[PDB]
């Protein structure tokens, strides 16, 4: 996953 919310 890529981007600010990748962890979610």
């Amino acid at each position, epitope marked *: 996953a890529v*981007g*600010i919310g*990748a962890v979610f």
Partner: antibody
Amino acid sequence: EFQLQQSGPELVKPGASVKISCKASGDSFTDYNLSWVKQISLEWIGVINPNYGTTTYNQKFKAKATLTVDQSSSTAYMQLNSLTSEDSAVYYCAFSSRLFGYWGQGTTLTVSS
Amino acid sequence: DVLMTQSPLSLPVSLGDQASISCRSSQSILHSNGNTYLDWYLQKPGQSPKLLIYKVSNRFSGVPDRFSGSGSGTDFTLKISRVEAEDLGVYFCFQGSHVPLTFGSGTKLEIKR
């Protein structure tokens, strides 16, 4: 194709509230989420997954911000409540997906009586 | 919260110089799932931040190879092998491992004269 669209500039009186929007569209992604970031210096407000309505907040913004989704239109909203001059800023929507992220153009909010 | 600091805050360079920007976190950015969600962004004036490097050292597609990232745990470094004019702007590191997600204060890459 891919597009990330944010609503336009807002002028709000102190103590009032405002609701701004962000929408991701295109055939280039499946699952995704949308994060809100404040710039006066970047600060993360929270994240919403529009397809599940799940949210995670920065506790700092738990009262100040409410994140919602209109699943009919796939449009995410952030409501900012009880505005002070601390809240005048640019608010970015940041899209995250399996293969790419992307930041919107930003929504400027100006608080003034 | 995980606090992110960058050094230096201002980095004057001549075109063609090597540039190094460091980022330190107050706790480790390694997530229990094994990933380290440390990203590097560039923001040009009047524009939205743009992703350069994700998860410490992965160049996003389209980012030139003069940009590279390294580090682990609490210490990270962005390097530009040879600065070009399009590189000037403010660089932010970002940790996306631990809520609230947080940004460094930013490093202004500017022209030396």
